[PDB]
Enzyme design. Structure first.
Site: not given
Lengths: 4, 238, 230, 4
Positions: B93-94, B135, B34-35
């Protein structure tokens, strides 16, 4: 609020 | 002659150092990701904050994993000799040990290793700060009602969340962690040692933030950042 | 409000688990020096020290369970020092490994209520992997908040011990505490332990593979306030 | 000097  | 107080990193080099910011908001469709709305607020906040701390900020946006790796290699190969420190901020993100480029994952270690004392010689003995907003897994916190130096030395890894846990972001305000990070820097970088500043960030995130969601699974959740320090001296920004 | 309340009637427990001898399912020489050095150090810090030796993984789990069910109401803080073989995320009981997380979780803010909002310190002298450092020449609070994990070594790396003097990390930890607990905040003390270990220690080995190696400990902080022992 |  959202998870990243 | 004269007496001691070398307890503190030498921060009066001609330059404070580079502040690199990788801002990944828009991800390739094929990845399923997701953005990251609001990350632009973080990226602006960070730039202004570290500008005031006299860092040479470089904002990068929406980099692939290959670009991320090449970027950090190039920067690791710069001559840093007139610089006090190095700063890298990752916004993406992660997963645990992993940051995502727009098209896939990068090992956080692979990035960190470019700057090891033996591998980036003009930063040997200087503070290397990695600020990671991402994350580290999928746990939710429901909270409770109240040879002469190591090649790994002189790194600080300021993670936004505990090992294994989600990291929260607000689409309007920016991420909880960067919000608090910037604010405490503004308020206290002229007054406090860096570890004490990051501790206020831990308190601010822990105390002042709680999730509001229409989804019961994700509602009323909490977060605690994670300070990971290999520093050998005190770090002051004045 | 920026520092932990440390004037409860009791500073708290200091639990020391010293695993030296492992079942034949090696002996950690010099660990008794550490266990002694820690007992004395945290005695001076006014902690209630309990030394345990040579515990199975089952005993470690149940020891930590029972301590977490104690009423810590009158105690400012909690300390646990783990002395053993280890891997990343793992500590060894005498008869095998146990997940560090499994130990830490007994004291989560939601499971050990009488420690909610008080500093919970875990000092871990163990391997976090098998890498060597060659060095280079020069809902209101999160359940995970208010832990401090003082690691002897960076993730992925060996932790060094000296058979005569004790481990590098505990040696330095105790020394800095002795010199600085009545002066510096705990993170700043731990930061000199980082410098002492990084700068004064270098391995000497007949085996080239393990010779002239270095070590940097790893401070992992979820604390929400400053901590002074004084 | 020995590894743990």
């Amino acid at each position: 609020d959202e998870v990243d | 002659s004269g007496i001691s107080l070398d307890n503190s990193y030498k921060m009066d080099y001609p330059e404070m150092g580079l502040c690199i910011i990788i801002n990944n908001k828009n991800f390739h469709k094929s990845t399923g990701m997701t953005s990251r709305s609001g990350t632009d607020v973080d990226a602006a906040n960070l730039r202004e904050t570290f500008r005031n701390l006299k860092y040479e900020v470089r904002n990068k946006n929406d980099l692939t994993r290959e670009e991320i790796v090449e970027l950090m290699r190039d920067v690791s190969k710069e001559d840093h000799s007139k610089r006090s420190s190095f700063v890298c901020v990752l916004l993406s993100h992660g997963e645990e040990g992993i940051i995502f480029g727009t098209n896939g994952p990068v090992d956080l270690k692979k990035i960190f290793n470019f700057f090891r004392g033996d591998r980036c010689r003009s930063l040997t003995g200087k503070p290397k700060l990695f600020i990671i907003q991402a994350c580290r897994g999928t746990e939710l916190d429901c909270g409770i009602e109240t040879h002469k130096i190591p090649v790994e030395a002189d790194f600080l890894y300021a993670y936004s969340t505990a090992p294994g846990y989600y990291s929260w972001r607000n689409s309007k305000d920016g991420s909880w962690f960067i919000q608090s990070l910037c604010a405490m820097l503004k308020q206290y970088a002229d007054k406090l040692e860096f570890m004490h500043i990051l501790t206020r960030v831990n308190r601010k995130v822990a105390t002042e933030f709680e999730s509001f969601s229409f989804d019961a699974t994700f509602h009323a959740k909490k977060q605690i950042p994670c300070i990971v320090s290999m520093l050998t001296k005190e770090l002051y920004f004045y």
